[PDB]
Amino acid sequence: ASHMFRKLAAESFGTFWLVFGGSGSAVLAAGFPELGIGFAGVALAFGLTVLTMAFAVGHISGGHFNPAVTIGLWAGGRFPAKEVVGYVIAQVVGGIVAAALLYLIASGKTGFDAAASGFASNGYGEHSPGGYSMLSALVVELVLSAGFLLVIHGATDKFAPAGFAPIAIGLACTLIHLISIPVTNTSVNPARSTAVAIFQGGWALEQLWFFWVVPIVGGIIGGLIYRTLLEKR
Amino acid sequence: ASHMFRKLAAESFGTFWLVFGGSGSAVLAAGFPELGIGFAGVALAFGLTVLTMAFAVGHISGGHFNPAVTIGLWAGGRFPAKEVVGYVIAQVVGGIVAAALLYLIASGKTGFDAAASGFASNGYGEHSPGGYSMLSALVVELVLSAGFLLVIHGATDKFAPAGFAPIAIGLACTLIHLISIPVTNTSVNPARSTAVAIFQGGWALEQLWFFWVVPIVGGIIGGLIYRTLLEKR
Amino acid sequence: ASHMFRKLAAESFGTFWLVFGGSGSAVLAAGFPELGIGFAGVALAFGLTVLTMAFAVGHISGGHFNPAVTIGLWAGGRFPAKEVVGYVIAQVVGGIVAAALLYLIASGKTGFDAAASGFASNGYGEHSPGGYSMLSALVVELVLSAGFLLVIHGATDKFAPAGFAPIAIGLACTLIHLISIPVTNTSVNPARSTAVAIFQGGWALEQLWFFWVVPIVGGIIGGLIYRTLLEKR
Amino acid sequence: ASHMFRKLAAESFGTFWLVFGGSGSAVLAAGFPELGIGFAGVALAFGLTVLTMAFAVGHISGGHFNPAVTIGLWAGGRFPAKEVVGYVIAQVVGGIVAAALLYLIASGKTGFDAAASGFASNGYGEHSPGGYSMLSALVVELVLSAGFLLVIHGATDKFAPAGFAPIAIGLACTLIHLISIPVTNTSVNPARSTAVAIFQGGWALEQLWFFWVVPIVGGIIGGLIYRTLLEKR
Ligand SMILES: CCCCCCCCO[C@H]1O[C@H](CO)[C@@H](O)[C@H](O)[C@@H]1O
Ligand SMILES: CCCCCCCCO[C@H]1O[C@H](CO)[C@@H](O)[C@H](O)[C@@H]1O
Ligand SMILES: CCCCCCCCO[C@H]1O[C@H](CO)[C@@H](O)[C@H](O)[C@@H]1O
Ligand SMILES: CCCCCCCCO[C@H]1O[C@H](CO)[C@@H](O)[C@H](O)[C@@H]1O
Ligand SMILES: CCCCCCCCO[C@H]1O[C@H](CO)[C@@H](O)[C@H](O)[C@@H]1O
Ligand SMILES: CCCCCCCCO[C@H]1O[C@H](CO)[C@@H](O)[C@H](O)[C@@H]1O
Ligand SMILES: CCCCCCCCO[C@H]1O[C@H](CO)[C@@H](O)[C@H](O)[C@@H]1O
Ligand SMILES: CCCCCCCCO[C@H]1O[C@H](CO)[C@@H](O)[C@H](O)[C@@H]1O
Ligand SMILES: [Hg+2]
Ligand SMILES: [Hg+2]
Ligand SMILES: [Hg+2]
Ligand SMILES: [Hg+2]
Numbered sequence: 001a002s003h004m005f006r007k008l009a010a011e012s013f014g015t016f017w018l019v020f021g022g023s024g025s026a027v028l029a030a031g032f033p034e035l036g037i038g039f040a041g042v043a044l045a046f047g048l049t050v051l052t053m054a055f056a057v058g059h060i061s062g063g064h065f066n067p068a069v070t071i072g073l074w075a076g077g078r079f080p081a082k083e084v085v086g087y088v089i090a091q092v093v094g095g096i097v098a099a100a101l102l103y104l105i106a107s108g109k110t111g112f113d114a115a116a117s118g119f120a121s122n123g124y125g126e127h128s129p130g131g132y133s134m135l136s137a138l139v140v141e142l143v144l145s146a147g148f149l150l151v152i153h154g155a156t157d158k159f160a161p162a163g164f165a166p167i168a169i170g171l172a173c174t175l176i177h178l179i180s181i182p183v184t185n186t187s188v189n190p191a192r193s194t195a196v197a198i199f200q201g202g203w204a205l206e207q208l209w210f211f212w213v214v215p216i217v218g219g220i221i222g223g224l225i226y227r228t229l230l231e232k233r
Numbered sequence: 234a235s236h237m238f239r240k241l242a243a244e245s246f247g248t249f250w251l252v253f254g255g256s257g258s259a260v261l262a263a264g265f266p267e268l269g270i271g272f273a274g275v276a277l278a279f280g281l282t283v284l285t286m287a288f289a290v291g292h293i294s295g296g297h298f299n300p301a302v303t304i305g306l307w308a309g310g311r312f313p314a315k316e317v318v319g320y321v322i323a324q325v326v327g328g329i330v331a332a333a334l335l336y337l338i339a340s341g342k343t344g345f346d347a348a349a350s351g352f353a354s355n356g357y358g359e360h361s362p363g364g365y366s367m368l369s370a371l372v373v374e375l376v377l378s379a380g381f382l383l384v385i386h387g388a389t390d391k392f393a394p395a396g397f398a399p400i401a402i403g404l405a406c407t408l409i410h411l412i413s414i415p416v417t418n419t420s421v422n423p424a425r426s427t428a429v430a431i432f433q434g435g436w437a438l439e440q441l442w443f444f445w446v447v448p449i450v451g452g453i454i455g456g457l458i459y460r461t462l463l464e465k466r
Numbered sequence: 467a468s469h470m471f472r473k474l475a476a477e478s479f480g481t482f483w484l485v486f487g488g489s490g491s492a493v494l495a496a497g498f499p500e501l502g503i504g505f506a507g508v509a510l511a512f513g514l515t516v517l518t519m520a521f522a523v524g525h526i527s528g529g530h531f532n533p534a535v536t537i538g539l540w541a542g543g544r545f546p547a548k549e550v551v552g553y554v555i556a557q558v559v560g561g562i563v564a565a566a567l568l569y570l571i572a573s574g575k576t577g578f579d580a581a582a583s584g585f586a587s588n589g590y591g592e593h594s595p596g597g598y599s600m601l602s603a604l605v606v607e608l609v610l611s612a613g614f615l616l617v618i619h620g621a622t623d624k625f626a627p628a629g630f631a632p633i634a635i636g637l638a639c640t641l642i643h644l645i646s647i648p649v650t651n652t653s654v655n656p657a658r659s660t661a662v663a664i665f666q667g668g669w670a671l672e673q674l675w676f677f678w679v680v681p682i683v684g685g686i687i688g689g690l691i692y693r694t695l696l697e698k699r
Numbered sequence: 700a701s702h703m704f705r706k707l708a709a710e711s712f713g714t715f716w717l718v719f720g721g722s723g724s725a726v727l728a729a730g731f732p733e734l735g736i737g738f739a740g741v742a743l744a745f746g747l748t749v750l751t752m753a754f755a756v757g758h759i760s761g762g763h764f765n766p767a768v769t770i771g772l773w774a775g776g777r778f779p780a781k782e783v784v785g786y787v788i789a790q791v792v793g794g795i796v797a798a799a800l801l802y803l804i805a806s807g808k809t810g811f812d813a814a815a816s817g818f819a820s821n822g823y824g825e826h827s828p829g830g831y832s833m834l835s836a837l838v839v840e841l842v843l844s845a846g847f848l849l850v851i852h853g854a855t856d857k858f859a860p861a862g863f864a865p866i867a868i869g870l871a872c873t874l875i876h877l878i879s880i881p882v883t884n885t886s887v888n889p890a891r892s893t894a895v896a897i898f899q900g901g902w903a904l905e906q907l908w909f910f911w912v913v914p915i916v917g918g919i920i921g922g923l924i925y926r927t928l929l930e931k932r
């Protein structure tokens with residue numbers, strides 16, 4: 001619970017939980033006829049994966065579960081450069097294992113088609129859920145990634161009352177999904193996008209680069225804003 | 234509030250609340266025409282029964298309310314073997330009393346049919362809400378049971394900030410229902426499955442064995458992972 | 467914030483907030499075409515009125531906002547008999563003022579009809595939303611009132627971690643509404659039922675006696691169970 | 700994080716987040732065919748913007764994000780007159796930048812029409828979502844603004860347990876939206892109304908004066924009630 005391999009295991013398990021729960025709710029439950037959970041149910045699910053695992057393993061690894069979080073916290077002066085790559089690998093691996101099991105579960109229902117349905121992948125333009133342009137996709141992911149990082153930096157500030165951060169951060173995740181699912185299906189998380197794109201297997205992989213660079217640039221901006229403008233004291 | 238019969242009463246009352254509230258929301262409110270609460274409303278209800286009773290009686294018994302939780306915590310080194318069976322009996326009894334009163338309440342509406350409607354029971358294949366295969370049912374219940382146990386172990390770790398665990402655990406329950414209702418109607422709780430199966434009275438009882446072994450195996454895996462991989466320090 | 471007239475003002479304001487917010491969400495928003503909030507949105511609203519005011523004025527009066535809570539806490543040995551009646555009056559008055567303003571607001575939309583729509587009143591049988599029998603109404607209100615009191619006693623126990631009770635109690639209120647709206651429109655609160663019945667002006671007033679005796683009997687049972695079975699230590 | 704320009708930056712960022720998230724969820728997600736989030740999803744989004752930023756930057760500026768909050772806290776004796784105007788400017792500026800980026804994002808979907816759709820603006824009468832009269836609009840905004848201020852004063856009282864206020868206040872915001880969206884689309888926040896009215900560009904601007912005076916009068920009333928009736932001790 002403090003040697004690096006335990007932190008990496010925590011990060012893998014937490015990103016697994018995020019992908020399995022968030023994407024799983026989208027694939028299995030969102031569009032279920034009459035009773036299905038909708039975009040709002042998916043948004044809640046994503047936020048709860050983050051809230052629950054932040055409480056469960058946050059005291060072990062920091063509970064990032066998201067390459068743009070790790071890199072943003074590096075930019076914000078909160079996390080060492082030398083640990084970044086190990087965390088990103090752990091997150092990507094955890095997420096892919098989750099998408100794999102989800103793919104197996106989803107395949108047990110007649111008619112399931114990962115490629116055709118999109119398998120909860122992030123896309124823009126032709127592949128945005130609401131047909132939003134690439135420019136709309138860029139602006140929304142940049143803003144929401146920066147804000148998510150600003151919220152993470154603030155809620156874990158020296159002077160923020162202790163213990164509440166998993167609630168602030170997890171519900172910031174729900175919020176972000178409530179806003180942006182129609183635009184990009186909501187990434188703000190390169191590991192989540194990657195895990196699911198692998199099984200969609202087509203356009204998701206062709207557009208994947210976008211859901212690495214934009215959330216990471218946004219997260220860096222959020223970390224820099226907090227570090228340079230809000231933190232001092 | 235610390236002699237065993239008070240702990241057993243707490244466990245019975247808490248499992249009663251889980252079954253009455255979670256299953257009750259499903260039976261009475263989920264499909265109500267136009268205004269009904271849907272799968273997302275049921276998921277919220279299940280999580281709130283756990284959150285509320287964990288705050289109410291967690292300081293008395295540990296607030297398990299779930300045979301797979303009790304057994305998983307035993308596997309994780311958090312709970313003594315000698316207390317396991319008493320807790321499981323208390324949970325099963327509490328749950329059956331709840332399903333009985335729910336059955337009475339539900340029967341007060343013209344047309345109600347427990348057997349035909351399924352009475353919120355857990356099933357797979359032919360009896361999965363979305364027609365998922367037995368293999369889909371196995372994987373989802375194994376993963377979500379293990380994760381639920383991992384979340385419970387982590388949120389109650391020595392180094393997790395105090396007081397927040399009922400929130401982490403209750404909302405993990407909501408999450409689990411948001412994901413898996415279409416697959417199995419969501420068990421991860423052998424006492425919940427049993428209580429309701431008794432009144433459905435048919436296929437629910439024929440498939441009940443599955444919702445004992447799979448959540449318990451999953452909970453044991455989650456406890457072992459936390460104990461052997463994440464806990465040390 | 468501790469002399470009795472401040473406590474009574476807190477109780478009046480808090481019950482006003484409960485009635486205005488819970489009933490208001492039901493009257494104004496629940497059935498709004500396409501976008502309306504449904505039973506689940508109303509349940510959330512009721513729970514949030516309780517959560518928010520418990521945090522706002524709980525440190526002043528105890529934050530009961532509900533005659534069955536006050537009386538149940540008396541039964542549970544937590545609240546003095548000599549203060550009960552003043553609290554009940556304050557709650558009833560606060561609630562009626564709220565229903566009055568809500569009635570005014572609702573009347574500003576063409577077609578509004580308090581009597582015909584039911585104005586969010588509690589009823590059974592012919593006047594149950596789902597056509598549930600009087601016996602169904604009795605059992606559900608008895609169980610949910612007792613459980614609500616058990617949750618309140620437990621979450622505010624000596625050994626419950628401090629500060630979290632408004633969350634446990636407010637979300638127990640949401641849960642209770644998620645379960646029972648189809649049966650009785652959910653009372654568990656005699657002051658809420660009274661305030662709204664006055665403006666429905668017909669069957670609501672004829673059935674009002676029921677939503678005084680049943681929640682109060684239930685609350686007393688919950689308080690007695692906690693006091694006599696769960697509290698000692 | 701305590702010199703005034705950091706507090707003003709916090710207030711600008713927080714009001715940006717409120718407008719971008721709350722209005723954004725309304726513009727992009729509320730009416731999305733089949734899966735859209737509805738009024739309840741928007742209400743949740745508004746409350747989460749406030750909850751998340753209150754945790755993130757509340758320890759910096761007080762986390763007002765709302766001209767009626769700033770002015771109400773002045774009225775309640777909690778905030779100095781000399782800092783009011785700077786906060787109000789910061790909130791208005793933050794909000795307008797957010798509406799501008801939202802306008803850009805929304806414009807990336809074929810058919811988008813800010814003026815015709817209303818762009819999430821607040822209105823009454825002809826421009827109330829449910830066709831409520833100006834009098835209905837007045838009463839609901841007055842009551843909900845006063846209550847929101849009462850909740851803010853209480854949750855941050857000397858004797859309220861520490862750390863929980865962002866939860867009480869953010870969820871009070873969700874509640875307020877659950878109630879009143881059909882009446883006015885919910886203001887209780889002059890900066891939110893202004894930011895969005897600018898881009899609707901028509902009736903929203905003609906009715907804007909109303910969503911300055913009414914929330915501010917209401918907030919002042921709430922602050923005065925708490926200060927003069929509830930606070931002493
Ligand atoms: C640590 C893991 C980093 C994974 C980054 C994956 C980015 C892949 O991104 C890109 O690669 C393909 C091959 O060139 C291109 O054809 C696609 O357009 C694709 O988006
Ligand atoms: C971190 C691991 C992610 C690897 C991303 C590389 C994606 C490869 O990229 C390609 O693969 C598809 C399948 O052959 C092709 O159809 C697409 O054109 C795509 O660009
Ligand atoms: C402590 C309570 C444990 C209850 C375990 C119940 C498991 C019952 O399980 C099984 O038993 C029946 C009779 O053999 C079989 O016909 C069914 O297939 C059924 O699933
Ligand atoms: C913990 C108590 C649970 C007891 C589970 C035993 C279920 C009995 O099992 C049987 O009972 C049904 C009714 O007769 C039969 O129709 C089914 O075939 C079922 O297997
Ligand atoms: C402190 C406030 C207590 C209010 C209790 C109100 C109970 C009214 O209850 C009853 O009174 C009417 C007149 O007899 C009867 O006709 C109705 O059936 C009604 O339900
Ligand atoms: C706490 C104050 C609540 C007073 C409850 C008394 C209700 C009076 O009761 C009566 O009033 C109606 C209107 O005239 C009649 O139509 C009904 O028959 C009803 O029983
Ligand atoms: C600090 C920012 C305060 C902004 C207050 C904006 C109030 C504008 O309000 C009014 O002004 C217009 C011009 O007279 C009128 O035509 C409109 O009816 C409008 O509502
Ligand atoms: C804080 C900045 C807000 C400025 C509010 C002033 C609104 C101007 O007000 C006017 O502008 C519209 C556009 O020309 C006109 O069509 C309307 O009649 C409106 O009253
Ligand atoms: Hg994340
Ligand atoms: Hg996230
Ligand atoms: Hg996120
Ligand atoms: Hg995410």
Ligand SMILES: [Hg+2]
Nearest residue numbers: 283298299422
């Ligand atoms: Hg459980």
Ligand SMILES: [Hg+2]
Nearest residue numbers: 279283406422
């Ligand atoms: Hg559970």
Ligand SMILES: [Hg+2]
Nearest residue numbers: 381406409421
């Ligand atoms: Hg569970």
Ligand SMILES: [Hg+2]
Nearest residue numbers: 279406422425
């Ligand atoms: Hg459960």
Ligand SMILES: [Hg+2]
Nearest residue numbers: 516531532655
């Ligand atoms: Hg209540």
Ligand SMILES: [Hg+2]
Nearest residue numbers: 512516639655
């Ligand atoms: Hg209540």
Ligand SMILES: [Hg+2]
Nearest residue numbers: 614639642654
């Ligand atoms: Hg209640």
Ligand SMILES: [Hg+2]
Nearest residue numbers: 512639655658
């Ligand atoms: Hg209530």
Ligand SMILES: [Hg+2]
Nearest residue numbers: 749764765888
């Ligand atoms: Hg606000």
Ligand SMILES: [Hg+2]
Nearest residue numbers: 745749872888
């Ligand atoms: Hg607000």
Ligand SMILES: [Hg+2]
Nearest residue numbers: 847872875887
């Ligand atoms: Hg508000």
Ligand SMILES: [Hg+2]
Nearest residue numbers: 745872888891
């Ligand atoms: Hg607001």
